[PDB]
Design a protein around this nucleic acid. Sequence first.
DNA 1: TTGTGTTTTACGACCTCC
DNA 2: GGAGGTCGTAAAACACAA
Length: 71
Amino acid sequence: TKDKYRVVYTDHQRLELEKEFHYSRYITIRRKAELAATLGLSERQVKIWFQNRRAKERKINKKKLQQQQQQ
DNA sequence: TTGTGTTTTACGACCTCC
DNA sequence: GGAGGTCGTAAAACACAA
């Protein structure tokens, strides 16, 4: 696990994760392992980041929908 | 400032998967 | 035979109108 209490990821670390997310919204066990290793993060952090990004996507989609219902 | 609204990490609870 | 999915939320970090 990781705690005390949350760490900020570097702009470069975020960038790579965003790219990879555009490549696929679900990361494979292998990919996860490549990415962790090259980014200096744990597999679990990568797991979780992918979970959060999908939640963010759901949240942005609901809003897109709420606007479209109103225009 | 500061306040107060939002975004980013990280969790636990609970659930699906032959 | 345990992994990863959602979800709601805590708290740190950031955005920025007043």
